[PDB]
Design a binder for this molecule. Structure first.
Ligand code: CT4
Ligand code: CT4
Ligand code: CT4
Ligand code: CT4
Ligand code: CT4
Lengths: 207, 208, 207, 208, 208
């Protein structure tokens, strides 16, 4: 087997419009943003324009193959794959995807998709010019699928919060915490899971 | 059966360009805006930029299936279903759809589609910097289907207007009231139903 | 024959890239702008930004069906139909179509398409703050089909011109005249028919 | 008698959109003539100008020819069904906003005419715009991928008025226009690339 | 023998655009080189530049080759028919605005050449732009999803020097472009993604 065959096989088995629920359990999607830049910020309107990599991780076993004597990874367009309907609940602009819309697929079915996204949010900018900084909280979860259908978690890998953050930003990152949360709506007993990324940041220059 | 089979079936039955009209009566489409944010008001131009979750419900019986031994619900792309051709009559920009464009379909035939839309309107902004606030009126209904094909009725419930409104907005919501109406034109015989949403709001933290 | 059948047959019989020309005679397209709003205006650059419903009407007899025991009108996507190739000759922006891209098809062959269009034009803005107002003239006609192939005609539909105009606009309409015309060029004899729409308007100098 | 439908279907089945209609080995003779409709948002500091123009573009594909003895002489055809020359403005700094329907005109002798109204920004000499001598903005346009052996671009010597189709309502006026032919070559590679250099000479209307 | 239409037909039959053309299990040697055309907006406070550049991209796809001994040895081909490297600018803050026809140039041996003019905004060091020694804006471009065992990027150590196609009408000027190679790795996984780093040394002209 070879890469042509892997991609060919994916076309035959993949159903992009059908959630790949193994049996009757939810598809566990691991979500994790890595902040790259903070471009525009508004102290009055409480809005921030941000650039970030949204590391996304789920499993789809229909796409699996034997990588005994063939590659165990390929890049595949997201248009050929089911992708989770993640939305940011406090975004006030369409997510601007800056990178090639290709997911990485492993022989064992586990998918990895990490687009760099510029997007504008509505969050608490208060304190941004102080030295304890502002805390902008972003809530990201499935727009249409609930607990039983999709579950969302953070990678919970504590490390360098400003590893890939631009040194040429006007701001700097103090902390980033990523917390699981089980939001529910007033219409219906239907709990939607979301990951709450708290971005603690301040403007550079101090006195 | 499974979710794969349900969607397969739905593709075969559903006709996206065919309004699923029950014999010879209008399709009942309910509409309900839930305002999330108010971004850029301009009292001079009488223009406001708004974010809202447009909760839309209707029945397409042709989508139905037996859910005894199968899931009762699935998310389906809006391109695989018929969707009401709703437009805001006083919009001055295309609706920017922020969320994934999937609808929610139940085996009983009812569709639920609630996108988060950002849009700019022309409406009465005067009074935004006052106690009583400005009242922005947004009229929404079918662009091509008249009252015999689409009837719109606002799912009105005096519960909580700012339930999902952002606390960090410059503005605060005083009141929202959704009201059914019906527009006719001196050109033509057809009447087009609509929902007027009166958004009464003002700036937070004014002098008293 | 239910709605599905009408619509099905329309898709089977429609020829989007072929003008439904009756014999030698042209296609009688009728066009009528109904001004909804005027948003931005500049007297220095002579540039207006205008919203208007472009009521467009023509006949394609191939689509006709017997509507004695059937629906007599249906809503159809304009990507399925032939559509007159209209252009605003003094436009300076691609027309932003704000409404759903659906036309109305009648069983006798008549097609009605009335999109709401926001568009930027180049025209006389001199006046505008005065009592007389300013007359912005807008020419709309076919881009590639001349008199013999496409004819344009304003629908002389007596209506006060502010019927659908926004009361919350910063400007107001004085008078709107929709005059038929026919522009011709220096390369070729080909004469192209246009509607010359005269928008006499001014700023609401309040009191 | 062949009707328009028959003419189109012939074109579709024999026109190869992604194949240059080379006649044996000789280059396809494209003709490019810009007609200027307006000049907008000028800037002498940054050296940049929005310009609207009709880009009259003519070439020929004789495989498309038919007998118009008792049938229409021309048809309008979408450009997606045709091969269209891959012209680009070399000093453009925004992608071209095509304002008009993307229909070409095919003539029964195989001749093809495409003339869109394009609104596009350029980097060029804007110095002198508020002087009587004016500024001279040069726009180079030619095939992005096909060399002289494959595509030749010719400026149409018409000798007409330069401000013929130009908007009288612009802030600026045209003094003179000259469409010269040029042969751009690159440091890396041998094969030469033809272009038309259009020198637009324009000045700000003396409002006094 | 074979015409251009025959060459193009064969390409669409052999070319699989979503499959990296790894000969053996070597990485694909994608070579990347920017050639700067303009610098339009610069902001020293926010560290953001709006640059226009040609992105000379070159690689081998041997599943495209053909016998050109009695046929043309090159063709222009739309990139949607070819596999194209998934190159991204790591510190780009806007999508790449491709200003030119999206056609690549394929040679009979399998060599593909794609040189799009692109306008794009970057987050980089603008400090000193108005000084004599200027600013140094570093742009990092490499594959987005393929690691070093799949795509290897490399600057064509071929100058070409190097304000050659840079607009003389720009507000700024180039002092030095240098294009060295790099190999970034991450904390997630042990696989290195090659990139090219283009240091643009520029400054506002002024006078002296
Ligand atoms: C830039 N950071 C990356 N990985 N990382 O672990 O941070 N890039 C590799 C990938 C990019 N897209 C997919 Cl899918 S994997
Ligand atoms: C935020 N409110 C939601 N549901 N709710 O019932 O309130 N979201 C779930 C869905 C959103 N769109 C569709 Cl369709 S289901
Ligand atoms: C909403 N206003 C309408 N007419 N009007 O005269 O105002 N609708 C009728 C139609 C609109 N578009 C098509 Cl097609 S039929
Ligand atoms: C706007 N000027 C035109 N002709 N002219 O000669 O000036 N229009 C007619 C055509 C437009 N596109 C094609 Cl093809 S023929
Ligand atoms: C403007 N520079 C060019 N080449 N160059 O090597 O400098 N143009 C020719 C090409 C443009 N796109 C392809 Cl592919 S070949």
């Amino acid at each position: 087997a070879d890469r042509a065959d892997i991609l060919y096989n994916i076309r035959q088995t993949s159903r992009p419009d059908v959630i790949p629920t193994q049996r009757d359990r939810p598809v566990a999607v691991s979500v994790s943003l890595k902040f790259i830049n903070i471009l525009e910020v508004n102290e009055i309107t409480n809005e921030v324009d941000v650039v970030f990599w949204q590391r996304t991780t789920w499993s789809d076993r229909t796409l699996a193959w034997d990588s005994s004597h063939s590659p165990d990874q390929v890049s595949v367009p997201i248009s050929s794959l089911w992708v989770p309907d993640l939305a940011a609940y406090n975004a006030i602009s369409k997510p601007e995807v800056l990178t090639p819309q290709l997911a990485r697929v492993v022989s064992d079915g586990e998918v990895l998709y990490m687009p760099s996204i510029r997007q504008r949010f509505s969050c608490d900018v208060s304190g941004v010019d102080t030295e304890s900084g502002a805390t902008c909280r972003i809530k990201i979860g499935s727009w249409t699928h609930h607990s039983r259908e999709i579950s969302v978690d953070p990678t919970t890998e504590n490390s360098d919060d400003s590893e890939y953050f631009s040194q040429y930003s006007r701001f700097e990152i103090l902390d980033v915490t990523q917390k699981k949360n089980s939001v529910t709506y007033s219409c219906c007993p239907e709990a939607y899971e979301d990951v709450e990324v708290s971005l603690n940041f301040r403007k550079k220059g101090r006195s």
